[PDB]
């Protein structure tokens, strides 16, 4: 075709990287390039999610479209020297890229075969800081399942209610939930965002002062950041209700230092079973004792001063799940809410209820 444009490397680099979401169909390894109305559009897709970037063209150009290998094109522009000028044109089934005395000829596929994602009605719409979205995902991402028969557990639930956005993730043995205000009256809506959507979501946040705008629409979610738009399919299924796995009346409240508890569990875990990773907790008046044994009959014991005045109790835990929660809390004091040795425990930051974590015990 007639497509032709010339742009600075510095204006093309971040656009290219973001649409290059790091063994597919031939066309799906390519970016769609579109020149039109002083704008260059770059699109990458995998039939389930889609990333579009827009770049303003201040130099002469000619409208047109084509597709080119995404990674090769990004590596070419990234390999050029800082401040380089990149001129692009079409020549039959080839795209010629020129910068200085560097010449590149990339094979293309017609743009008419690049798949467009059909339209969908937005049902919920809101904007929130990038830092808020970052906190919601980092608080729960680790609890997601991976390649679970229940395809709905591989993703992360995104729930709206009143003034708050909520994320939930669970693999069947432990659960994480986190709610954040965003200062807008929103409808109620529950959707599941697949694992890869969560990742791509995280990738879009540049920790800048450009708010994030979300559109949720039954079977699709969309996110806007600056000149970037990410669209992903949702997972069709019913997510379990976190309210029904929260322990009722966990009246045995233990409070301990975040860091000291973590170091004690990390040390005990050295002599725990490599497969099951079980540690044993003995809770008594203002004292917590952690023990661990492995098939080799090695033993570890930790004693910590804590705040606790309830009944004595013995309870076992996968220490990896406990450490996962403590690292996600990044807290100064942690609160554990216990019921009995065979019931789930709720763990929270002692001074914040925004996030909550539920972990099932083991039998030892």
């Amino acid at each position: 075709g007639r497509m032709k444009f010339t742009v600075e490397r510095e204006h093309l680099l971040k656009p290219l990287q973001q649409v290059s979401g790091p063994p597919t169909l031939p066309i799906l390894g390519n970016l769609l390039l579109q020149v039109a109305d002083g704008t260059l559009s770059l699109t990458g897709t995998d039939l389930e999610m889609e990333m579009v970037a827009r770049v303003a063209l201040v130099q002469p150009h000619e409208p047109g479209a084509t597709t080119v290998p995404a990674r090769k094109f990004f590596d070419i522009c990234r390999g050029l020297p800082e401040g380089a000028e990149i001129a692009v044109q079409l020549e039959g089934e080839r795209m010629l890229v020129r910068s200085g005395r560097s010449r590149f000829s990339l094979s293309t596929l017609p743009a008419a075969d690049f798949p467009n994602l059909d339209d969908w009605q937005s049902e919920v719409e809101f904007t929130l800081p990038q830092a808020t979205m970052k906190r919601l995902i980092e608080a729960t991402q680790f609890s997601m399942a991976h390649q679970d028969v229940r395809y709905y557990l591989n993703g992360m639930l995104f729930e709206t209610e009143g003034e708050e956005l909520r994320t939930v993730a669970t693999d069947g043995h432990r659960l994480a939930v986190c709610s954040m205000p965003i200062g807008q009256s929103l409808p109620s809506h529950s959707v599941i965002v697949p694992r890869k959507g969560v990742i791509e979501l995280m990738r879009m946040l540049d920790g800048g002062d450009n708010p994030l705008r979300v559109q949720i629409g039954s079977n699709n979610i969309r996110a806007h950041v600056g000149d970037f738009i990410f669209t992903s399919k949702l997972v069709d299924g019913r997510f379990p209700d976190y309210r029904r796995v929260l322990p009722k009346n966990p009246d045995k409240h233990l409070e301990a230092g975040c860091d000291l508890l973590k170091q004690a569990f990390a040390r005990a875990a050295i002599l725990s079973n490599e497969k099951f990773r079980g540690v044993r907790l003995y809770v008594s008046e203002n004292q917590l004792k952690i023990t661990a044994n492995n098939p080799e009959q090695e033993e570890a014991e930790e004693i910590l001063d804590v705040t606790y005045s309830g009944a004595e109790m013995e309870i076992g835990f996968n220490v990896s799940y406990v450490l996962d929660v403590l690292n996600a809390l990044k807290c100064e004091n942690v609160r554990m809410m216990l019921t009995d040795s065979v019931s789930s425990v709720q763990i929270e930051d002692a001074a914040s209820q925004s996030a909550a974590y539920v972990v099932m015990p083991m039998r030892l």
Binding site: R150, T170, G172, H173, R174, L175, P240, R244, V245, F276, N318, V342, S344, V358, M360, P361, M362, R363
Partner: peptide, 10 residues
């Protein structure tokens, strides 16, 4: 290794 009581699933 009992589970979170999802309903079903546990």
């Amino acid at each position: 290794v009992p589970t979170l009581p999802x309903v079903p699933x546990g």
